[model samples]
Target: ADVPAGVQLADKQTLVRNNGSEVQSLDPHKIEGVPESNVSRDLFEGLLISDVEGHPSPGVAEKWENKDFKVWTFHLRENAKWSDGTPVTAHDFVYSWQRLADPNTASPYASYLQYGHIANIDDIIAGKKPATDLGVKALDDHTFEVTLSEPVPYFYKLLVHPSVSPVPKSAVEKFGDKWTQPANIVTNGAYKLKNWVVNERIVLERNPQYWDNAKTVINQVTYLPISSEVTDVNRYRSGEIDMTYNNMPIELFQKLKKEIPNEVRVDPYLCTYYYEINNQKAPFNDVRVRTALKLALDRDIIVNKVKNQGDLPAYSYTPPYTDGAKLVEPEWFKWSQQKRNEEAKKLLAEAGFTADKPLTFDLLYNTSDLHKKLAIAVASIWKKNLGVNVNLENQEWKTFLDTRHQGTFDVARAGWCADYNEPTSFLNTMLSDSSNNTAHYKSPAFDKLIADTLKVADDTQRSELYAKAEQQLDKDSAIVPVYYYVNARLVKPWVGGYTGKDPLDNIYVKNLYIIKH
Candidate 1:
C-alpha cells in the first residue's frame, strides 16, 4: 500500500507540490498562475466542481437540475460552513454574481458575464443597467435559481473557473483588500490558510467544518513556488518535494519514461501554441503576405526536430475531443513540401518582395528555453523558404504580456489553454471587438456566424455554421496554430485523485490520500 520505493513522502498525510513560479494574488478575480489556482481552488467552492474526467461533481450545491431548457435550480447542502462558521447559503451566490456585474467592482473577468448563458448581464456589465438586474436569484437561504438569455447545452460542463466562485461579504468588509492574507482570510472550500511567504511557500490546513469533512483525506497541503526548471526536478528527485507538474529537459524526459515509468505521465491538455501577427501593421495587414508566411513554415519539423514530448502539429486552434471542432487547412498549408515551397515562392513574388526588397519583421516571445528554441527555428524556416528576415526579441513573462497588449512587436508568441471545454471559447475571440484578439483582426462576416449560432439551440445546425466561419479564418490566415499541447508531469504513485486533462487544473487537496503499509 505504500508509494513507490525511494520516494520520501512530504509527510504521512501531507502533499507538497511545486505549482508555479509565483503567486500573483489570492483574489480569484485578479490571478492566473498555477500557484494562485492551487490556493483559490481550495479556498472558494463553486456551485459545481469538475471530476477527474471533467464531468460535473457536487460542491457546495449538493444537487441541481434543469427546470426547463433555459432555466436551472440548485439545492445547497444544509451542513455547508465557512472557515469562520458562517452558514453557506444561496444568498451568498447571488451576492457574488451581482458584485461581479457591478461596474464599481471592476473584476478583471467581468466582461465574461455577458456570454449567452447569462441573462441581462450585457446591459449590466456595459453600464447601461443596474447590477441587480442580472438573472440569478435566491428563493430562500437554501435554494438558488438562474434563468439564461439563451439555453446553453454546455452550462454544466463549464462550471469550475474562478470568476464564478463565491466570496464572503463579511470577510471583505473586515479586511478590505488585505482579506486574503493568512491572518484575516476566511474560506469556504476544503482548506483554510495556515501560513504564507511570497514566492516561497503557502501552507493550508483542512477545514474541519467542510460539509464532507468526513471524506476529506489530506490534513495539510504546501505549495512551493519554484523559480527554475533544473532546481525543481532536483528537489523532486531528492524527496524535498512530493510531486511536480512540468516538462523535463529533452534528455531527462526520455530517461524518466524508460527508467522511472511510474513518475512520468503525458496527458491531453486541450491547449494550442501559436503566434499572432498584428493585423493592423503594414506588411502583415496584407492578407497575401500573411498567407505566404503561414505556407512557408514546416510544423512537422518544429514539433519533431527536438522531440518535444506531448506535442503534435496543429491544424486548428480548437483541439480534438472538443465539440464543433474542425480543421480548415487550405491547399497552401497542406500540400506536399515541394508543392508548398513552390507556392510560397510565388506568393512572396506576388506580394512585391524580391531580391532587392526582402520580407522583414520582428518576432517577440517570452523568456523560456523552449520558446527561444521555437522562435529561432521558426525564423530560420522563413528565411530559407521565403527569403524573409526576422529579428528575434525576448522579455520576461509580465513584460511580454504588456508589450503584446501595446502592439509593440510585429509578431508575438501566444497560447490559450482552454478556459472552458467549448469551441466558442476559441472561436468567439476572432470577433471584431474581442479583447483577447490582440492582433486586432476584424471580421464582420465571422461575427455574424457567432451571433446566429447563439440564437439557434440545435447542435447539428450550429456545428455546420461554425465550420463555415472557421473556413473564413483559414482562408484569411488570421492566425497560424503551431501545435496542440500535452501536459507532462511527475506525481508520486501514492498521490491519488488527480485529474490529468482538467481544463482549470482544479485539484482539491481534500481528495488526495496517502497510502501507507
Candidate 2:
C-alpha cells in the first residue's frame, strides 16, 4: 500500500481501492453480490447505518423507537438530501421497501420478508396480497413507520443491509434500466458519482450535498476493478492503485504470511464456503446421497492441507459466532476420518450405488485457483471414500451464477456471507421459498422449524428453535457444509481505518484518511 493515488493515479485528498472485476448490479434491490454492495454503500444512504465500529447508528433517520415491538417508528433527518439536492424522505424508504417486497420486482432477497416478518409481507410474497399491503407507511415527509408480523430483535442492525437502501423513484422512471450508469445515476451517500466504466472502474467525488459533508475528509475515491489476484496484488505493490479491499489474493496466503507479514491479515468473518446439491434432480434428490457426500469429504484436511490457513471445518451453515451456530455441533459431525468414511460408504450403498456401479456427478464452481484446488481435494476424497467420480467444472462468476439459477449442475460450489450479524441471516436462505435457494431444496418440515423460530420475539426461545431448524438441515442433509470463512487480506498501516472484518467488508471512506508519504 503506497501513498497518493486517492482518486486516480495521483490526488492528495483521494483514496483508491481495487474492486474485483464485475459489480453485477448497482441497483441495490436488484443485486445480491458483495462487490455490488461495496460500491452501492458508497453511493447510497440507508435509514440506519453501521458506525465505524460496526454498531447501529442513524443515517437518514436520525432516531427511531420500537413503539410497541410490533410497530417501529423512525424520524428522518430534515437535513438529509440525495446528492442531487432532492429531499431524502420517508416516502423514499416506503417506496424502496415496497419494491423489495413486490413480486413483480423479482428481487433475490425477496425471501427476506418472511425472515424479518415485516408485516403482510408473507402474504405479499405468497401472492395472496398486494405489495401495498406491506407493513410500512410514510406518515409525513420525515416520519416513517414499519410494522412487523412478529418483532425482529435485530431489525435496527438489519436496516444497514445494502439491499434495503432507498432508491430514487425519479431516477428509475427517468432512466429505466440504465439508471445505474454514470450519466443518469443518482445517489444519497457522502460521495457522488464522477464516472463508472463497467468492468473497468468507478470514480467517486465527495458529495458537498451530504448532510455531514463538513466532517468527511476524503474528497474523492476511485474504485478500479482489477479482478485477477495476481494483477491486483501487482498493481498494489507497484502503486498503480492505493490499496486493495475485498480483492485480497488469498491464494497466496501461506506465502504472504511468511514473505510480507505486515501486508497480511486474517480476521474471523461470518461466512460459509460450501457446495450445493441440485435437489431438483436425481442423485442429489436422495437424502442418503447428500449424506454420503458430506461424510466423504474431510473438511479438516481441506483446511489444514488444501487451504493451509484461516478457515474452520464447517458442520453447519451458521458460523460459530451467532447464537444458533454456537450450540453444540452434533456428535457424529465430529467423528474421526475412518468412522466418517465407513458411514459414507454405508449410506451410498443404501442409496443404490456400489463400487462396480459408482455414483458420478459434476461439481460446478466459479473460476478461481483456490476453488479449483478445493474441488480437486474434495473430489479426491469422494473417489477414495465412497467410490464416486466427480467431474469438476469451473465457470466465470456471472456464468456460474446463471448456471446455478437454471439448476444445470449436479453439485455446485457455493458460499454465504451473513448480511447482518444474525443466525437467521445465515440459516434462513435455505427456506423453500428463498430466491437464493440454488439447490432448489424444498422441505415443509425445515420451513416450519424456521417459521416456528421466527414466530416468537424472544432470543432465548428463538435460539432453541434455531437448533431445531439446524437439526432439520443435518438430519436431511439438505446441503453439505464444507467450512466457515476467514477473511484473508493485505492491510497497509498508513491506509487508516480499514479493518476488513465486517461481513460485507464495508469501509466508510469518509472515516478513512491516509497518513504520511
Candidate 3:
C-alpha cells in the first residue's frame, strides 16, 4: 500500500521516499522515494532488476539487444499481467514514457532519465517538441525499442529504475487524478495495495494476477510510520511491531545494545550527514571563511557524543562504501597535525581574522537532542579552534527544513542517503543545480565529468571519473561531512525473513513472514 503525503495532492509524476530512504512506490512514471520504489517494484515489474550483488538482471524483459550500441530492443515476458488480470504489454511502457515526458507532467527526476538513454525526453517536456518524439517506441505488443542519444552502458541499469516502469494506459485514463489513490491504484507486480491511510498505516496483499506470484513466498506486509523513538522501541519490545528505523533514540539504542546485542544491529550506512553553508550569502561567499569554519568543526566528538553508536566520522562527502566500492581517503586525513593547524591558520589569516580578532557566526540545527548535542559540540569547537564565537539556534525538524529551503540559515545541518545504489544517486542529485541541491552548489567541471561518465561502458572508467569528481568536491569543502550512517533496528525475534536491502529505511513486508512454524 502507498503512504499518503499528508495534505499534498499526489501528483502523478512525484515519487515519495521517506526520510530514511528505504520504502519506495514503484510507479515508474512519477516522483517517489526509494522505499516506495521498492514496493512499487514488486507491484510493477521493471524491464530489469538488481541482483543480490546490486547488478542489473532481467525482470519483465526476457532479453534485450543493442543495435550498434545506440538503438536497443527489449523482449517482454509474455506471461506478465497487471493486478487486474490485464496483459502487460509494450504499449504500457510506451504510454508510461510518453506521459512522463509530456510537458504537463513536470517530474523532478525527468532530467535523470534525459541525461542518458532518454536524452530527447527533456526537450519534449520543455515543449521543444511533441511527446511522441520520445526515443521509446512499441514495436509490437511484447517488443519495445529505445534509441539513446549516446551509448550508455548504464542504460539497462537506468531502465530498472522506477522512472522507466510501465503504466497501463487504461488505468490512467480511467482514474485520472485519482489514479494512484487507494481504491484506484492498480499494479502489475507480486503485491497490490490492500489498504492505505495517510500518516498511519499502509498494507499490501499478494497479487493473484502477477505473473510470478507463485514464486512469492511471503503473503502480506504492513507499514506503520511510528515517528517517536520511545514509542517505536516500546512497540518492538512489547512485540506489537516487527521493526523500527531512524527515529530510534540514542539512550534507548545503548540500552538495547547492552541488553540484547543480537537484536540491535549496527553497520555503516551509505549516507552522509553534513552541514551546508550558504555560499551565495555573505561571509560564506569567502572561500577562506568557509575553509576556516570547516577546520573549526570537531567531527569526532559529534560522532561519539551525539550519534553514540557505530557512526563513522566522515571527512569526505561520499561515504566510504557506496555501491559496494570503498572510497579512498584524501591526503588531508594523513597530513601532520602541525601542517593542518598551519593551514587553518593561513586560511583564517587570509580571511582577515587573527587569533585576537576572531570571526563570529550563527550555527543552526534541528531541535532533536542529538542535533542539540552536535550543535553545542560544533560551537565549542569553533570557539576553541578558530577563536570564533558561535551563536547556536535550534528549530523543530519541519521549521528547520523550511528555514533551509528559504536559505535563512548561514550554516545548517543536513543529511543525504542514496536513493539507489549508484554514485550518481547521491552526488548528482545533491551537488547538481537541481531541486535537491539545497546548497545550490554549481560546478561545470563536476557536471561534465558526471555526464561523461554515464556514457562510459567500462565500470573501471566510470569508477575513476566518480573518484575524480569526489576529490574535487572535497577540495571545495562545499559541505562539512560529519558521519556515515548505519541503519540499526530492533526487531522482535518472531519476525522472520526481513531483509534490509532498501537503502531508504522503508521495510518490505512482502519479503517478511511471521514464521509460525
Candidate 4:
C-alpha cells in the first residue's frame, strides 16, 4: 500500500485564498489590517515565528536569552539568507527596528515597540530623540541585543508580529516606497512576491533561499482581495479558490455546514467585535449614556441569531482565551434581558434622553454585507429598547478606517484581533496614547494600571493588574463588547495539515500539503 495520508495528489502545488480586501500597503511597518498581515507573514519572517499552536518559535534567531525580561539577546542563524542571497544578520534586524521607530518613516505601527517597553522607543516616537536611540543594537554580525525600559515576560511573543520583521536595507534605500514591488522585494521567509496585480491578486512563490525550504509543501500562494463573503463562498465552490477568508455569510453558514461538513471550519479566534464610542463626543461623553447603550444591545441575539456562527457574546474587551487574563464582567451582565431593558431605559432617561427627545447619533461601519446586517439589527434593537434614533452610514474599507481613526463618527463598528495571546494586546488599544484607540478614551487610572503590569514580575501580581485594566474599560463603558469572533472559513478537502486550532488563525502554507481530491 503505497497510498499516502489522504489519497492522491494534485498536479498543481498551489493555494488560492481570499484575503478580504485590497492590502493598503506591503511595507510591514505601514500596514494595519488583516489583509496586509496575511501577505506580509508569508513574504517576510520575523525574529520569531509562530508554530502550529501559534506559540513563539525560533525563526531568524536560532537561540535567545533574556535577563528578567528587560534585556534580551538573540543569536542569528548563520544559514538564514534573504531571497536575494544576502545573509540575514543581526544588523538587518537592528536597522529595520530603527527604521520602524523613525519619525521620518512615519510607520503607523511605530508604537508597537512601546508595548514591548523597548528602551527609548517612547522618546523616539515622541520625537524627543533620534531613531538611532532605539534600544535595539547589533552586538555583533550575528548577535542582536534589545533593552527594555521595563520587564515584559511576553516580549518574545511580540517578536512574532510581522511589523517587527527585518527589511532589506539596500532594496528599501534604492527603491523607496517601490521596494515592495515584485521585482524589487527581498524576503527571508518561505515565500517571495512573484506577481502583484492591484485589486486583483497577489501571488507568491516558494523561496528556495529559505532556510527550511525543504519542508515547504506549496510552491505558489495567491491571495485574492475578495471582500464579499458570499462571493468568496461561490468562488470556493467553483474551485477558483482553495480557501475562503476567515468569515462567511451568516445566512449561508447553516447551509454550508450541512452541504460540506468536512470543508466548513469555525474555530475559536482571538478577536473582539465591538462598537467604539467617541468619548470626546456629546452623548457618548456621559457614562450613563454609554452604559445604557451597551446594556440595551442584545448581544445574545447578535451572536447566536444574527451571526449564527459559533461566536460567544462578549462582555469584556479581552477575549477569555488571552493568556493570564481574567475576564471581569460588569454587574449588569447577570441581569435578564427584560431587566436590562428596563435599566437601559432608566439610564437613558437619567442622561436626559427621553421618548420626546430620543437620543440620535450616526453609527458608521465599513461597506460589507455582514457589517450592514449587524448595524441594521443593532439600530432596530436600540430603537425598540431605548427610544433612540440611529442613522446608519457605511463607507468603503479605507475610508471607514480613516474616519474611525480621526474620530469623525459618533459610534463606529470596530474589531480587534490579538497581536499576541496576551491581554495587553487588547487592553493597550484603549491606552490614552495608542493610535489605534478610535474611542479616544483617556483615563489616568486605566493607563496607570496597564503601565504597572510591565514592572511586576510575579504572575499573580500581573494578573491582578490585567484584571484591573479590564474592569477600568468596563467601568468607563469605553466600548460596547458585541461578541467574540470565530475563525470561520471553508477549506477544500484536499488541503491537508489545516490545524485551525491556533486562536490567532495564522495559516502558514509551509505547514500545509495538497492531497488528491
The TM-scores, one per candidate, come to 0.89, 0.93, 0.80, 0.96
Instruction: Report how far off residue 265 is in candidate 1 (Å).
Output: 0.9
The candidate 1 region of ten consecutive residues with least summed lDDT is 1-10
Q: Write the per-residue lDDT of candidate 1 for residues 117-156, one digit (tens) a residue.
A: 5789878877899989989999899888878888777676
285 in model 3: Cα distance from truth in Å? 3.5
- Colliding pairs, model 2: 6-14, 6-15
**Highest TM-score: which candidate?**
4
- Tens-digit lDDT track for model 2 on 65-174? 99656788999999998888889999999999999998988887787766667889888887899999999999999999999877676777778877788999998889
lDDT of each structure? Answer: 0.75, 0.79, 0.67, 0.87
Instruction: Compute the lDDT for candidate 1.
Output: 0.75
lDDT of 1 at 366: 65
What are the clashing pairs of model 4?
Answer: 8-516
Question: For each candidate, C-alpha RMSD in Å?
Answer: 3.4, 3.2, 7.0, 2.1
Greater-lDDT candidate between 1 and 4 = 4
In candidate 1, list every pair of residues with a backbone clash. none
